[PDB]
Design a protein around this ligand. Structure first.
Ligand code: HEM
Length: 410
């Protein structure tokens, strides 16, 4: 235990992160105790254990990601922190979705699901999504000023999911509503949502979608997923249901928050914003994701006694990967605290470290990001912040709820 950071300091506390990301504190661990145990003697929310290991170095985060055979996702799920009213029961059924599964079921399911995220599948959405990105930006610009999150950041990630699944336009409203209801669990502004009922209804909708496409096939990814490959592999209707639920949370608030933090970074760095508007560099999306790191941390659970960075980890202890720390590791990134959209190479772990659970939607997210910022630069290139960004109350998701902006910059 380093003298500079006491073990009782909870890096994942939602109240702390509402105020700020513990950036300086993580930086301290990297110099003194890169693998660090956090004490929560009263019992952690949801899990009910007495603490967790925190991994702060880029190299060590990659090693954990790579060694799924000893660092599992199913005992406690990937999400590393829950409020105190969270039950052990709710934690232990996170395993019903891909993110929180281990081998062999994860191996089979990811292989099938990967059909939906080929270059062809993603690239075929580009025209429709660009069209929408433009109209999103134009509509916001016409308002003069307003909340950037709701008027610019929010819609395109949702539409991307919709266009990928081939959701009919008349159903997208309730789809978006359900998705947005599943993005709570701490913040008091969202205290009257029902995420459980929303997930239930979303599963139901998805299952019927699979049953319809089974009789009337289309050229969206749903048909690709529910039909047997050369080896007879396919998603059952319920599996597809839990896949859609997975998508609703995985590709919604993540991309949304990368866009908002992206624009904030551009506001704090006029030089880079001018550079983007003039050259539209392809490296921009990845520096945005590194800078935002929408997922601050995900965890694993040790399936057996194991040594990591000279530290003995005991079976059942949780191992939390700090993506936020790793993405600013001074041994990996040159000038990590400079926002540079031309950054190359850019080995960030914002989409996770290479391994079994590496983000399957990463290229879809990059496309979404590129399209919305191309549209912003095209329809509101002189936008300026009016108010301070209001942060989301979450211990692991680096979210922004609101950000008042003058689009015409007048
Ligand atoms: C900037 C946007 C995004 C970020 C930062 C992000 C981040 C991540 C991260 C860090 C993981 C690793 C989970 C772990 O190792 O425990 C992950 C997994 C995953 N992501 Fe993304 N994601 C983004 C966008 C998307 C989108 C747009 C989709 C789909 C439409 C998506 C679908 C998934 C799925 C299905 C998984 C689970 C894969 C598995 O467990 O095998 N993500 N994401």
């Amino acid at each position: 235990p380093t003298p500079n950071i006491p073990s009782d300091f909870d890096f994942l506390d939602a109240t702390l992160n509402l105020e700020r990301l513990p950036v300086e504190e993580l930086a301290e661990l990297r110099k003194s105790e890169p693998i660090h145990w956090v004490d929560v003697p009263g019992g952690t929310g949801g899990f009910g254990d007495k603490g967790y290991w925190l991994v702060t170095k880029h190299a060590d985060v990659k090693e954990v990601s790579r060694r799924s055979d000893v660092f599992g996702s199913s005992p406690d799920g990937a999400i590393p922190v829950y409020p105190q009213d969270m039950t052990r029961e709710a934690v232990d059924l996170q395993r019903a979705v891909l993110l929180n599964m281990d081998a062999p079921q994860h191996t089979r399911l990811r292989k099938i699901i990967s059909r939906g995220f080929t270059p062809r599948a993603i690239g075929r959405l580009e025209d429709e999504l660009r069209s929408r990105a433009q109209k999103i930006a134009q509509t916001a610009a016409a308002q003069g000023a307003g909340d950037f999150v709701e008027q610019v950041s929010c819609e395109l990630p949702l539409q991307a999911i919709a266009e990928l699944l081939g959701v009919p336009q008349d159903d997208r409203d309730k789809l978006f509503r359900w998705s947005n209801e599943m993005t709570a669990g701490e913040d008091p502004e969202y205290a009257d949502v029902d995420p459980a009922m929303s997930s239930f209804e979303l599963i139901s909708y998805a299952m019927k979608m699979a049953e319809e496409r089974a009789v009337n096939p289309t050229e969206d990814i749903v048909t690709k997923l529910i039909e047997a490959d050369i080896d007879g592999e396919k998603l059952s209707d319920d599996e597809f249901g839990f896949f859609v639920v997975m998508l609703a949370v995985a590709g919604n608030e993540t991309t949304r928050n990368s866009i908002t933090h992206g624009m904030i970074a551009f506001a704090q760095n006029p030089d880079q914003w001018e550079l983007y508007k003039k050259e539209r560099p392809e490296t921009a999306a990845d520096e945005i994701v590194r800078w935002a790191t929408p997922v601050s941390a995900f965890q694993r659970t040790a399936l057996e006694d194991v040594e990591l960075g000279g530290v003995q980890i005991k079976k059942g202890q949780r191992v939390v990967m700090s993506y936020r720390s790793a993405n600013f590791d001074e041994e990996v990134f040159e000038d990590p605290h400079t926002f540079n959209i031309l950054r190359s190479p850019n080995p960030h772990v914002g989409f996770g470290g290479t391994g079994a659970h590496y983000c399957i939607g990463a290229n879809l997210a990059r496309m979404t990001i590129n399209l919305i910022f191309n549209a912003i630069a095209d329809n509101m290139p002189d936008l300026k912040p009016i108010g301070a960004p209001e942060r989301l109350k979450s211990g692991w998701l680096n979210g922004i709820k609101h950000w008042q902006v003058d689009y015409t910059g007048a």
